[PDB]
């Protein structure tokens, strides 16, 4: 009972607006019936190609590459290898190519939404201290993982030449606005924190025009998505329970294992094990739907995790105090 | 004479972000092929149903209704009445749909941009005291004129039996967010400023998540629309010239007449007249595009008014200062 009820109010007040901006979208798409499915797709495309890239750019630019945390980087890199080995072991005694189930597992188990709903919740629970750690995690998720996952997707698609696979992955990666956003953000943060350069006021305000409102529109787009599909749970209970258990139990569990091995101390420990408990990302669903690799589970998990994030997040916040 | 380039920099910095958003939309619609007409319509509808009404609520609820100068309100109403009379006279012998032209003549002549270009421009030209007056003008717009304009739009749509048409217009004006928002906002403004009630943090943040970035998305919609037109001057050179005359030679002139009638004096007179020569806002265009009532004319007016916002304002300042 170390955490007082006052902090529970902090978490709830930080999470409620995100759910309001999502319920509004769901009701507008399904009940109020304002947006036709084509209009919903257009809104989602705008949010995922102009708002998310600029939000990622600003988040990555507001961090210091020269003052990163090597321990945190190593812990995050080791967690996603422990997940790979766990999935490989568990796919040998419980199942065509099985590599699809490892790509899906890494998309479902370890890929928290540390960008749209990561900053608010964690920053409210742990103040401004979390912000920097979350940016550090976001740069990695945007530069290393979201690229290796795409490479794995391409390799799976080719299975049906590695050099041909690499060429195709590179060709499809460049057109992604998020890659350009991340690269420019890093290349600019380096200059900002080395030569002391700062954005001109015009550029900063222009970027903030499209990015400062991207967080709410992200959940609005997600609500439109949930409204679009008829069956909330695309598959039976089986998938839903498996994916929820995988994300919320195995994810933070392997993160705890990696942190203990690396001996992360104090706030880094608590903000690094609790950030792996955040609901699922959407980019993995984008990849799955584009390549049609079990898109019926990657979304059943995304929406369910988005619905259930608050109670589990509070539960792990209480647990970490112990 | 003595105007420093610093003020020019302020005006240009306030104006550029809108152009950045508009050009991004235009490129996304024309050089790229991201958005189809239905998706652009969906984005515009979202902006007209979720962002503009929330911004209206914020503007109304953040201003005291008991500390608004009645003289300014009366002068604004007089200007609108004079413009309506003048346009009715002009359309009586120098004309298709007469009501379809009054809406577009009151959308580019008596609806400046007093929330983005107006406050920086005319708060740097004059002292900070004009901020309160401009805020009064903006709340008056969002409270009265943006409701009367939507009523006229719905009345025009119904026409496309006087009692039946008015009944249809009213029944369509009671299920529009921009009508309930301007009522809830004023009620809450009165409550907060006469009883001390403060909006809860959760609701305020939830409103911010959506309203924020509304201007960027609206200008993106304007760029997307302008991409459809064959040329930037979609309404034609004659129509562009007449729009410029309506917005920069008729608006300010009739506002000067209104101020003389109501005897406004001191900086209030200058702040009231010099704020009517600012480029027309985008909300009229958003509503026109949503209701498809000569959107090209208003879009051209906005595009070619944001370019010459500054020189006309300097001319008017020099005239008034004399
Ligand atoms: C606590 C102290 C009090 C503080 C003040 C209270 C709240 C904070 C203020 C927020 C500003 C919101 C302004 C817009 C509200 C009015 C919209 C609305 O209420 O009516 C939408 C309308 C529903 O009626 P209907 O059209 O289905 O016709 C029904 C016909 N028959 C009855 C026969 C079935 O539908 C439509 O057409 C259009 C649908 C779009 C609606 C979206 C508009 C923008 C957002 C509205 C909700 C706000 C969310 C943020 C805050 C939420 C948490 C408080
Ligand atoms: C050699 C000549 C060819 C190259 C042309 C020249 C430059 C292009 C590269 C960079 C220019 C910077 C603009 C931002 C990057 C986006 C460029 C781009 O083209 O993206 C690729 C893509 C278009 O691919 P596609 O044409 O095949 O259409 C198909 C696309 N699809 C299949 C996805 C639908 O674009 C999209 O879809 C949407 C892109 C939206 C971009 C939104 C902004 C991204 C964030 C930027 C952060 C920067 C902030 C400024 C900081 C300044 C610091 C000093
Ligand atoms: O039209 C006006 O006077 C105010 O101009 C705007 C300001 C913000 C938005 Cl989001 C849209 C329009």
Give the closest ligand to the alpha carbon of residue B50.
1
Nearest CB partner across the interface for B21, out of A210, A214, A215: A210
| Other Cβ atoms closer than 10 A to A258 | 23
Print the domain residue range for A179: 5-321
Positive or negative, the Cα torsion across B160, B163, B167, B169? positive
Compute the distance from residue A290 Cα to the ligand 2 centre, in Å: 20
* Continuous H helices in B94-161: 98-105, 118-125, 130-140, 146-159
- Assigned token pair, A21: 């901006």
Q: Does A33 touch chain B (CB under 8 A)?
A: no
Dihedral-angle region of residue B196 (phi above 0 means left; psi in -120 to 50 means alpha; beta otherwise): left
C-alpha B209/C-alpha A20 separation (Å) is 9
Residue keyed to tokens 């550090």: A136
- Residue B5 CB-half CA count within 13 A: 0
> In chain B, what residues touch A43 (CB-CB under 8 Å)?
39, 42-43, 46
C-alpha B101/C-alpha B81 separation (Å) is 16
C-alpha B292/C-alpha A200 separation (Å) is 38
A196 vs A55, A60, A63, A182, CA distance in Å? 22, 16, 13, 20
Angle, vertex CA A263, rays to CA A261 and CA A264, nearest 5: 125
Nearest to B28 by CA among B222, B249, B180, B244: B222
Residue keyed to tokens 């939404």: A113
Ligand 3 close to Cβ of residue B133 (< 6 A): no
C-alpha A190/C-alpha A184 separation (Å) is 10
Ligand 1 close to Cβ of residue B86 (< 6 A): no
Angle, vertex CA A55, rays to CA B207 and CA B46, nearest 5: 45
Q: Under an 8 A CB cutoff, do A215 and B209 touch? A: yes
Report whether B139 belongs to an annotated binding site. Answer: no
| CATH code, domain carrying A40 | 1.20.1530.20
Ligand 1 atom nearest residue B181's Cα: 13
C-alpha B277/C-alpha B251 separation (Å) is 7
Q: Does B27 touch chain A (CB under 8 A)?
A: no
* Residues A246 and A110: beta-carbon distance below 8 Å: no
Structural domain tally of chain B?
A: 1
> In chain B, what residues touch A202 (CB-CB under 8 Å)?
12-13, 16-17
* Residues A264 and A199: beta-carbon distance below 8 Å: no
């Amino acid at each position: 009972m170390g955490i007082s009820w006052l902090d529970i109010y902090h978490v709830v007040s930080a999470t409620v607006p995100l759910y309001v901006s999502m319920t509004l979208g769901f009701l507008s798409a399904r009940h109020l019936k304002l947006f036709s499915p084509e209009q919903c797709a257009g809104i989602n495309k705008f949010v995922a190609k102009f708002s998310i890239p600029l939000l990622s750019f600003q988040i990555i630019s507001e961090n210091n590459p020269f003052k990163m945390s090597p321990k945190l980087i190593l812990s995050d890199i080791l967690q996603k290898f422990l997940v790979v080995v766990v999935l490989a072991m568990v796919l040998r005694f419980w199942h065509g190519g099985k590599l699809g189930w490892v790509i899906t597992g890494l998309s479902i188990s370890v890929l928290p939404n540390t960008l749209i709903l990561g900053m608010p919740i964690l920053s409210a629970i742990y103040g401004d201290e979390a912000a920097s750690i979350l940016e550090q995690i976001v740069v990695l998720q945007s530069l290393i993982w979201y690229t290796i996952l795409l490479f794995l997707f391409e390799l799976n698609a080719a299975r049906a030449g590695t050099m041909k696979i690499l060429l195709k992955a590179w060709r499809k990666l460049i057109i992604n606005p998020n890659t350009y956003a991340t690269l420019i953000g890093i290349i600019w943060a380096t200059l900002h924190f080395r030569l002391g350069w700062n954005l001109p006021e015009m550029i900063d305000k222009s970027i903030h025009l499209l990015s400062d409102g991207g967080l709410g529109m992200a959940m609005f787009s997600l609500g439109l998505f949930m409204a679009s599909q008829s069956s909330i749970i695309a598959c039976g209970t089986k998938m839903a329970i498996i994916t929820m258990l995988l994300k919320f139990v195995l994810g933070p569990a392997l993160m705890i294992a990696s942190a203990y091995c690396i001996r992360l101390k104090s706030t880094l420990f608590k903000v690094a094990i609790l950030q792996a408990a955040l609901p699922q990302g959407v980019v993995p669903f984008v990849f799955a739907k584009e390549y049609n690799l079990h898109p019926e589970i990657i979304s059943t998990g995304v929406i369910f995790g988005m619905l259930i994030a608050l109670p589990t997040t509070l539960a792990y916040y209480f647990l970490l105090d112990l």
